Amino acid sequence: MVQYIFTPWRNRAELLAVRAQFYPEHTSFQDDEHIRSEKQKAVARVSMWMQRGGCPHMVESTALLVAAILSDEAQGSGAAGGYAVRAAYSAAFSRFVTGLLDSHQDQSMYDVAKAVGLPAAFVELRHQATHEQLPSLTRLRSAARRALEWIWWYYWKGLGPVDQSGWVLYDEKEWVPKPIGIV
Amino acid sequence: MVQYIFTPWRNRAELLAVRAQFYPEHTSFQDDEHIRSEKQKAVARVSMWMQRGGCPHMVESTALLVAAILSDEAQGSGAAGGYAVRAAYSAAFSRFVTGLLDSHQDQSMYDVAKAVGLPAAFVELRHQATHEQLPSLTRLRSAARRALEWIWWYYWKGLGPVDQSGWVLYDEKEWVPKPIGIV
Amino acid sequence: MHHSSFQPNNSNFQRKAGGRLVLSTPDVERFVILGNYGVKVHQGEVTIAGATLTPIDDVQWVHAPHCHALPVLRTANDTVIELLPCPTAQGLRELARLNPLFGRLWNETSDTFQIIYTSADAPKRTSLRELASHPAWNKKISELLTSTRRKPSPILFICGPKSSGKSTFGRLLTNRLMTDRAGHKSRSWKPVMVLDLDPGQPEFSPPGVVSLTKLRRPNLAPPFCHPGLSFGNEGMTTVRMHAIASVTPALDPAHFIACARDLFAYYRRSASQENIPLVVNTPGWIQGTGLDLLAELIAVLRPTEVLYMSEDGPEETVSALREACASSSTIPFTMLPSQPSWTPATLRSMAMQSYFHLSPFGPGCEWNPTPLTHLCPWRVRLAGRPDERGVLGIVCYDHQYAPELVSDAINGMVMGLVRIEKKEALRGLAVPGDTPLLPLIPNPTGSPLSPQYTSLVGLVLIRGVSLTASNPELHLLTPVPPSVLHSFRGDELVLVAGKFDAPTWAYVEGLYWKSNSKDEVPWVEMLH
Amino acid sequence: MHHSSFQPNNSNFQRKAGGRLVLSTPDVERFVILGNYGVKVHQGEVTIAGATLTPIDDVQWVHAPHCHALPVLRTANDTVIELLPCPTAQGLRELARLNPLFGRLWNETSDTFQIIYTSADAPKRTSLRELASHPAWNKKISELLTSTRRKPSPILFICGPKSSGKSTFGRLLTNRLMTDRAGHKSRSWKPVMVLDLDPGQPEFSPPGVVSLTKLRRPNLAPPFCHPGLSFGNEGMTTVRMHAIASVTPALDPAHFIACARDLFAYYRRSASQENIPLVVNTPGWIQGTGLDLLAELIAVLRPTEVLYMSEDGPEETVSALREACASSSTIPFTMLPSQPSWTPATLRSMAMQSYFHLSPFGPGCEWNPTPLTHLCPWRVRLAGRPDERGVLGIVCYDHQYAPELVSDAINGMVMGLVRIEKKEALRGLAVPGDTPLLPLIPNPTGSPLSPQYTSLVGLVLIRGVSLTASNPELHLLTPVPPSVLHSFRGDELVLVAGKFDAPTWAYVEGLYWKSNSKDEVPWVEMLH
Numbered sequence A, B: 001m002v003q004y005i006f007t008p009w010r011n012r013a014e015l016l017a018v019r020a021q022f023y024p025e026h027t028s029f030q031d032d033e034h035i036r037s038e039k040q041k042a043v044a045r046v047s048m049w050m051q052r053g054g055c056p057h058m059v060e061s062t063a064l065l066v067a068a069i070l071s072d073e074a075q076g077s078g079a080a081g082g083y084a085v086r087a088a089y090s091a092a093f094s095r096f097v098t099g100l101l102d103s104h105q106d107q108s109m110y111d112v113a114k115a116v117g118l119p120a121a122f123v124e125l126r127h128q129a130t131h132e133q134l135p136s137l138t139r140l141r142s143a144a145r146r147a148l149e150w151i152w153w154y155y156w157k158g159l160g161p162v163d164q165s166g167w168v169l170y171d172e173k174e175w176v177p178k179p180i181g182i183v
Numbered sequence C, D: 001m002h003h004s005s006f007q008p009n010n011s012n013f014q015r016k017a018g019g020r021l022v023l024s025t026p027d028v029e030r031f032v033i034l035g036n037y038g039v040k041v042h043q044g045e046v047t048i049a050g051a052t053l054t055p056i057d058d059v060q061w062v063h064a065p066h067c068h069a070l071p072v073l074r075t076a077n078d079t080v081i082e083l084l085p086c087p088t089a090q091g092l093r094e095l096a097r098l099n100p101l102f103g104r105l106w107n108e109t110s111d112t113f114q115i116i117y118t119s120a121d122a123p124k125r126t127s128l129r130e131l132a133s134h135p136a137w138n139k140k141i142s143e144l145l146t147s148t149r150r151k152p153s154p155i156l157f158i159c160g161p162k163s164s165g166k167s168t169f170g171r172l173l174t175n176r177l178m179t180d181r182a183g184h185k186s187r188s189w190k191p192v193m194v195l196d197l198d199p200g201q202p203e204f205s206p207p208g209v210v211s212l213t214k215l216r217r218p219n220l221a222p223p224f225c226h227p228g229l230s231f232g233n234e235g236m237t238t239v240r241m242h243a244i245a246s247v248t249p250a251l252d253p254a255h256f257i258a259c260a261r262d263l264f265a266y267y268r269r270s271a272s273q274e275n276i277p278l279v280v281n282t283p284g285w286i287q288g289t290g291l292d293l294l295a296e297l298i299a300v301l302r303p304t305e306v307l308y309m310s311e312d313g314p315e316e317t318v319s320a321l322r323e324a325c326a327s328s329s330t331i332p333f334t335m336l337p338s339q340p341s342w343t344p345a346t347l348r349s350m351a352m353q354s355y356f357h358l359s360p361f362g363p364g365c366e367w368n369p370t371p372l373t374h375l376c377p378w379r380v381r382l383a384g385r386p387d388e389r390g391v392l393g394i395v396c397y398d399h400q401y402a403p404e405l406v407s408d409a410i411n412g413m414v415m416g417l418v419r420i421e422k423k424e425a426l427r428g429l430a431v432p433g434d435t436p437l438l439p440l441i442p443n444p445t446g447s448p449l450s451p452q453y454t455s456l457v458g459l460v461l462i463r464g465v466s467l468t469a470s471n472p473e474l475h476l477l478t479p480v481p482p483s484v485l486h487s488f489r490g491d492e493l494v495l496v497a498g499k500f501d502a503p504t505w506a507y508v509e510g511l512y513w514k515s516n517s518k519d520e521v522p523w524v525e526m527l528h
């Protein structure tokens, strides 16, 4: 009965909901504001999951990338002044690539990358970011977008179709056994 | 005559100016706004230097840290939603620590760190950030602040005390030789 | 009546009576009993994992889990031993119906305890280890003992790299100090205090808690066989506990040291009267942050003797420790060997689950096998005033949370009941008042509640938050007896939520019970 | 008159006359001349680094920089050679007063060229290499040559790992194809085109530029001895150039390939008439991005023969290349040996500086030794309309810039004059109009100007931006002759600013000249 996998999300609907929030285009002025708002909520939710314990690496990566993208296109006294955005992007990529390579390992960085199917460009970008002179905003922007689409193919698309009364002992005559969590 | 060191900044005054902008406290509602504004300008300037080519690693690190800090304490629809800030911080630390350790190398991470004088805490934070679950905002915040003070002691404090007329050939009768750059 | 065998050894008249065994031995002989049993030396002298029992002694219960190293029993010339069957063990055994891991941990025979004879026992996948000891270990212990007998209450600081023998050595040291009875006409037993500063795999407390314990009887059982000693003739009692809410002290070193100070303070107060040696076992870090922590700990406590269980450790850690030791101007620093499957994670988890199944009240501590789901929860109110509410609020450690998320994040995890002694604790937080939402106490900084003015009163497992009505309430279940819970006025009681490693075993437990005896279980994804 | 020595070898009557040397040789003999000299085979036949000269030939100038491998000269039976002193070499020599690196690069004797005899030359820190060649290399070249003589204009794609011999091999191949004269009654020389797709250490262009060159004479000199061939009987002419603005094609692969396409297109057009083989030398990447680029290049160009100069390369790169090669259904793929201090950085820098000192007018190209500071700059206007301004604006590659910073960032660096052919280039940018600030053309995307509608017209060094007056102007100095500059109406001319590796040598140059001949120099921090 080792057929028990534990997840931080309560059930399946919640996971699908988060998926929808992240990728409105595939799942499908005021409308734009709505979309942005939902994305923010999704990111926060994922953060909670991470703390709870046990979370697919892909989910964490997606969250990071989306958070960075949101920060970049934020007008109104708070657009990070350009250098911060470039840092957020670099961090996201480093974590994403490190995770993928570390997972499918028994070789060299590029060899593993090719085996998995990860375009070498990402590996190079990661290496460059870590050791020398964080890349330019334009490259990071385009790369991040591609990364999201790739992640969609590799993971998300397979998760389903696309449509002193302070302490009173509970009365031992009204209680009914029920799983931990439900009320 | 190998006594020629090249710097991206034109002269010394400019470097000192940037130093002043970064650390108002030591160098010394409206006042707060002023300080923030200046810090932003300094960060941008450093970015330019980096592109120009040739720049002390410490300067780059300081710029990154300050940029992150600024992003964190920005109110008004644009505070990065918490996850981005944590990413910016992680990226800054990774770059900073990697640089210091790489420079003073011929051992182990911790050994080199101890030799330089870098509190092991930073090395650990870096390692953790790269491989697993970016640290919490509180730790990053405090760490960044300490990092800045340390950098001040290690580098900044030693840089000085603390107080078809489109193309016309220039007239070969009015020109006077003068270094490249001055006008 | 002459049973002889490689691992064990000879014996004599073996009288079976009423379910117990009266065995006589006319010569030095070693046995390796397995299971749950009680020893009561009728005549002579016997040694058990560091202790020594003579005719003038009470029955001593021994738990020999098939996991660790079965305690060896050595009998001396002209002895008669009476082996009694342990009662409360039955409850613990039944715990196998709630988790297959607790199944293979004892004898799979009929009675409660089975002797062994080289291989005639130890069912499939034996891996039957045995408690041994280099002569060096024993010699050193002897030295410490004799030195102690001519000085005041010593302080022994035990440290070393992971899987080195810190715990086992501590076990032996404690038993020897207590039981010794060198020649002062038995002085029957000298009490002993144990300071556990290891949140990882603790001893005398559930995972994630630091604590100070007082022992009157020899410690002859693994950690998951008494993870929740009674709070407050009382074989083992807990003097004070503090919650760190992480399985790694590397989330707030300052707090960790602060806790160490407070606990040691209490020890100082108690020691002042009756001479009682203190044995402290530290974590298993030997590089970076951990090494620094160890240095500070040595400075703060000022241990009389430092024992490093490596003898071939890295020059960095050894040098650092020696320097710190030298600083306090006079501290003996010695090194010992190490003698180097159940991973730490699983062991820790077992400890936790055992704790939650502890019965609210022998010899030791009874266990209740009924699954947690069936138990009736404690209904705490979340709508009133700080005099008719119960819980003063919810504080978060090392991480904040948006209001909305908190309800989902808290639900299902393990938190800790912290009792406020002096109001100088929440001094710096926006404490909610009269006031539907959870009374969340915003804590911007993130630092945990000070240890000087707050004490842990056991852990709590939440099984359902329902704040959608006109009676916001929290259903939570704990092991703490009702007596203590009711005596707190509700105005001084806050819940701390940190890491703790989500108790995944809880959810499945119900399903296992139902199937073994022979539907939208949250967080459990059934593979079919 | 019989000079014999290990490295060189025997000779005969050596007649010194007017400053030149008439040397007779009655038997096969090898010489290793060093410096700057001219060869004019009077009678017989001689071979020089791949070429073959007979009585019916013009004087050929050879530059043998002490840096690379001195070209060896082999003379055949019954020959008389006349060695002339090169004139323009004098100007190049004087460049040593502007950079000590150019000092130790030739003979430190009296005349312009000195013969050698095993060690009687080559002053201190000799490190005097010599051009050699495995028989395999020669055999392969012979095969390619004979095959060519019976087919149309071949395309040879040369690649391989760093420091393998791609460049040297190319040199030999080019000279042989041109000079061969197998037996068709000399057909005197077949023209040859060279496509340089290596921004790193380019050949026939300054660092950071890709280009297509046409050669009528043998190439007998290093890259920094003709980095700026004339634009537009014309020994070497440049057909088209494109600016990549980086020393690494890993900043915009799409652009790199696009450039390759455009240049090859022109080659196709020219080739269509007169048969002219094309030799292309690629970068030095063999893993990751670079490998992919190479694959694409092979697909686009469809080279007739691929030469990999490794013979022991990693299985990954070799396999990848073989697959790509196979895809075009028929491409011979061969491997050759490699035969494995002046680092690439310094060499590249030298190339750049040499370029900027090129005189505006082989035999070759004259040089002007006057320091850049003294030269009179070109005054371009920055206030008017797109018909009375001069520069249409400033575009940035791979990186943006805040308005204010731009003035400081641009100043002092190297940029490129790009001529717009068709207005379908700036289609997608907010082109400034009439309009004090620099007319910056905002480019959000960051991609470089398309290669189909834009061409590079040489590089420019800026020596001072002064936009604080009522006549905004830019002082810039370039090598481009006035004739070309004036013929552009100013409406089609934009400046591209990328990386280029800040020309640090420029600043110091003035100081060196002043001191050698024997004050707030920006960017130079003098150590005292």
Ligand SMILES: Nc1ncnc2c1ncn2[C@@H]1O[C@H](COP(=O)(O)OP(=O)(O)OP(O)(O)=S)[C@@H](O)[C@H]1O
Pocket: C068, C069, C129, C130, C131, C132, C133, C134, C161, C162, C163, C164, C165, C166, C167, C168, C169, C201, C284, C338, C339, C340, C344
């Ligand atoms: N002399 C010994 N006799 C019996 N078992 C031993 C002996 N030495 C080591 N072991 C085994 O070593 C293992 C680790 O023992 P511990 O004393 O827990 O070491 P430890 O340093 O406490 O491990 P950590 O770091 O706390 S998880 C146990 O499972 C023992 O069975």
Ligand SMILES: Nc1ncnc2c1ncn2[C@@H]1O[C@H](COP(=O)(O)OP(=O)(O)OP(O)(O)=S)[C@@H](O)[C@H]1O
Pocket: D068, D069, D129, D130, D131, D132, D133, D134, D161, D162, D163, D164, D165, D166, D167, D168, D169, D201, D284, D338, D339, D340, D344
């Ligand atoms: N057969 C040879 N004869 C003479 N010199 C040789 C020979 N083979 C290699 N070398 C030396 O090898 C060095 C590199 O030669 P190149 O042909 O430039 O190799 P490369 O692959 O072009 O190097 P990169 O990657 O372009 S910097 C030169 O300095 C030559 O002197």
Ligand SMILES: [Mg+2]
Pocket: C166, C167, C168, C201
């Ligand atoms: Mg232990």
Ligand SMILES: [Mg+2]
Pocket: D166, D167, D168, D201
């Ligand atoms: Mg080359």
